[PDB]
Amino acid sequence: NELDVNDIYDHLNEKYSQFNDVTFSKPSTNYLKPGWILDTHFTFGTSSEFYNKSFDALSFNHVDSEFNMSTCNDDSECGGVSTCTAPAYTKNKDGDAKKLCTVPADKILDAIYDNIVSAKRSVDIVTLQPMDISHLNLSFSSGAFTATIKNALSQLAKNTQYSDHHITVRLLQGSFTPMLGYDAESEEEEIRQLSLTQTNYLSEIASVLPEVNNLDITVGSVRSCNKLISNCGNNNSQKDVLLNVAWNHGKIINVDNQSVITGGHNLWGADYLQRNPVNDLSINILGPIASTATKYGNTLWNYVCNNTGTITNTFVTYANGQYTYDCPAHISSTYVAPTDAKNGLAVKVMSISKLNNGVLDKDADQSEVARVYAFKNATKSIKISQQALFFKGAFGKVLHPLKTIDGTVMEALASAIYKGVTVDIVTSSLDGGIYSSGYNSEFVYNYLLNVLHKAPYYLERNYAKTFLDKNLHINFISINGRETNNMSHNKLWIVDDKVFYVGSHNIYPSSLQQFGVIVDDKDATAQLEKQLWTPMWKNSIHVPI
Amino acid sequence: NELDVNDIYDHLNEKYSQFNDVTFSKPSTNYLKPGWILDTHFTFGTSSEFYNKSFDALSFNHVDSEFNMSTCNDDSECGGVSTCTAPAYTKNKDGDAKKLCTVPADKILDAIYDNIVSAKRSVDIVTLQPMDISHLNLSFSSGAFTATIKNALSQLAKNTQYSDHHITVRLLQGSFTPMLGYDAESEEEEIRQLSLTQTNYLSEIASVLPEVNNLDITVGSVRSCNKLISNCGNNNSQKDVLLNVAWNHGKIINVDNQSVITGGHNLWGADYLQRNPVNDLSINILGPIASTATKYGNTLWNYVCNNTGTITNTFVTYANGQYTYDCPAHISSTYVAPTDAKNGLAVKVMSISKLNNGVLDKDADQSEVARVYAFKNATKSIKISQQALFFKGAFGKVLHPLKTIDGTVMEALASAIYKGVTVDIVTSSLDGGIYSSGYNSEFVYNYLLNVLHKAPYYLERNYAKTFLDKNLHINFISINGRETNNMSHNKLWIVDDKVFYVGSHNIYPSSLQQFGVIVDDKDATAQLEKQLWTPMWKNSIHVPI
Amino acid sequence: NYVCNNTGTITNTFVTYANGQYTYDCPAHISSTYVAPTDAKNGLAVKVMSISKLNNGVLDKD
Ligand code: NA
Ligand code: NA
Ligand code: NA
Ligand code: NA
Ligand code: NA
Ligand code: NA
Ligand code: NA
Ligand code: NA
Ligand code: NA
């Protein structure tokens, strides 16, 4: 007994059989090729000053405006940790690549471009709208991601120009509601603004495609709850104004119902691929798991195309030279193995999702249950990397990870610690600005103390401290064990160096929809720990208090 | 040459004459006796370890449950900075005081007790409902404040037992809405909960009064807006869900329309008078300025008693052995000088208030305007001590100090910095938990940088930095220049070492009603700087940019 | 003006394209002050007035 994903699946099926193949899936065999780990961050062990020199232009060069990297003739003109490179994703519609000073984090761009240009049937993108800090209401992507996507689609149009059939391209973003600059009473104006920015995004794509092409491209926005004054559709015990809105938070790039990129990354260039990068993780996986991703998309897209009534969302499509309202509610989820699909490491994988709070029935939150069960059944260790574990409610109330039929994450971690299981946690830093941890390490320690004081344990405070001091270690991310304002956006956990989650579902609470996958494989986990967990942990900071 | 409060009054009267004697008042002569500065905080220049020893009890003593201090036989049994003392505010209804290890912060208790037991007509208490951290739903006061109030009222009842007339005692709290444990759709249940806690508080007071006495005691709660989805009644340019609720935030203890305690202190014992105190300031003043506070009280109580329209507030009275709904809507505001009123330092003072967002007309926010004018017309220096200068909106949007007809606080400070005025700022620490500054120093620096980039300055970024580097110094509060998690709740500013504000109005934005006073006097300002500003500044921590 | 300060209600809708971008900049006002073009006085000079009906939901019912 060292936790198996089949146990998670069986538990969900016993308790939530009506959501089988809606918010979770039977484990399936999938394949991880070299580079499947899309971990982006500053280079652990160096300094921010040095890493950030990777974006300084030298020797009669400039900073390219599309990709926000220095131009380039050879490695000697590139500073920091960067090198001169001519990536395919810089190839514009006329076929010309650029020489840029690239860094390891750009691997994510490489992964996206390569996957999209290979499409023969469908490109399915789900994400979170870029935050409106000040700028102009951007959609779907920002910075280098945008150019990358455009360039990919351009290439795709050429690769498919003789295709028997058209390629369906779906871009869908969850949108904050009420939107920046509008009270919740102004739904109509909100829709108009969303429509405008989506139209501009689509028109920009269109202007880099051949006049005649086989790409049917749709852009859409999805929000499922704007009530604020009442429940969105969940079984929470906690109540807060900030839990009474909801929209998609899942992050998927799904090509041909075969290749999936999923994890914590939004497609926000400045946050990941420029100075002072935020630490984040996605993965690139091939196999039947893509079916689940597609179902997830289809759920959302079905909701966008047909919901009537309550909230009203918006979308538009460009195909055969025309803007239309042909809504792509459904891409087929039936898996067809591509040739040489079994290349790479075979691993067992299931999906888990959160699709309640206004899309599906209020019981449809199987992600929380899955992770609580995982932690409750850890036998050796739980490694967690997150942005935050708690979330500040509207009037300062601390909101904790949500209640499930099996309890909360914090109750499960308390159980683990009481049993002697090691719990290592990495949060973002407190001085993380937009990506703050929200609460310091002492707060989490004391919260778990209080859990052990109540409940079935009834432990006296100092005796409980013994368990915590032995088995709980809370650190926050740092590039080098010195800097105290670095940032992380991870949604990662690993049980027994064997089973791990990658997806969008923070441990801190919200009502947003989520998608993620659970991998069960010792070899894959060992790779992930060698590449990300161990360097990050080694360089993290611990506040003793 | 320097700033004169009369110029502030003249500006408000020219632009908002219809709110004269409503939200502001003509400067009047008032009196500050020794002890007028009720600044409570740990002992600057020491350490939290040392200060917190003030609440250690020896084995043969204990920690009194009413006042959360150690019992006591002589000074040698008291640790830290405490001494053995038998304050009058420990005197219970039977006339028995306790020996406790008291600290300098307890001065605020002394001021409340002493002021209340001297009443001959009225006791008028306005405050903010205790935060609900634990689903306890306390009212009006917590910790040693509760006992103090009770004991004061007990003593008051004896001091007035042969009075020709009854004494009006009003206790009014602004209540968070929606309340903890309730979505906003549940107004009725919320009112019931408020009524329950107010009834228990009043019954507790009654149980320590004589069976027959001349006190008419009313407890009440006030909220002026619970919409969430639309404007509460202001002229803001910013829009945010968290600005669309409102309740009283003003803090007043007004005895006989003569003696006023006002400032930033909520009546929350554990936050000020125990270990790890929050730094805060109130003042004890006597004179016609009390009129203005009484008026402020009246405006709220009227609103509660004559339930205008939609929102329903709640209150209850205990008098002549009976609970009733006799609503004390009006205490007379005409000032009558007590005998020996001219004792102490004579100073010019005016009131300023914020009574919009559902109580009075939406234009009735003269506090913001007055402070903007003061900063814009500073000639030498501006000293600011705040908890925070910015506030995080519902979905992460930064909310800045609100717009007035004369612009914002940030625009005024940018103007002062551009002209060469010195601007010293102390905030709470970032790691201050519930009393966090919310944003780091660099964020403030950069916000003001962007203000200087815009019209009318149009300063290039690097050159604008030189203005900030020369004239702006932002620190955060620390007991000793070493600890980084200390906390401040100040709402203080001082212009030209002459004019200073004491009251409830944070610089960071909200829609809550506020009351405060502006004192114009070099002698008083110098006493305040010696006692509070200079020690705090010398021990504050500067994070270089 | 009516379209710009009552957009959304009924069936009133608009969009602008400018500088390669779609926006909701609403051209509620072109200047009505007349400037004679050069050689404007070419042709037959005639006396003309305008008359309009801006009733029925746009301006006052009169
Ligand atoms: Na990154
Ligand atoms: Na990073
Ligand atoms: Na570069
Ligand atoms: Na999609
Ligand atoms: Na993909
Ligand atoms: Na949660
Ligand atoms: Na106390
Ligand atoms: Na005390
Ligand atoms: Na302060």
Tell me what the structure shows.
The PDB classes it as hydrolase. The entry lists the keywords Glycerophosphate phosphodiesterase, Hydrolysis, glycerophosphorylcholine, lysophosphorylcholine, hydrolase. Crystal structure of phospholipase D from Moritella sp. JT01. Chains A, B, C: Phospholipase D. Organism of A, B, C: Moritella sp. JT01. EC number of A, B, C: 3.1.4.4. The structure is cut from a larger assembly and holds three copies of chain A. Chain A has twelve helices and 23 strands. With 545 residues, chain A is of the alpha+beta class. In chain A, strands 2, 5, 6, 7, 8, 9, 10, 11, 12 and 13 form a ten-stranded mixed beta sheet that branches. In chain A, β5, α4 (144-159) and β6 (167-174) form a beta-alpha-beta unit. In chain A, α1 (5-16) crosses α8 (366-376), α3 packs parallel to α4 (144-159) and α10 (441-453) crosses α11. The longest helix of chain A is centred in the middle third of the chain and has 20 residues, at 187-206. Chain A is globular. The two termini of chain A are 36 Å apart. The complex binds sodium ion (9 copies).
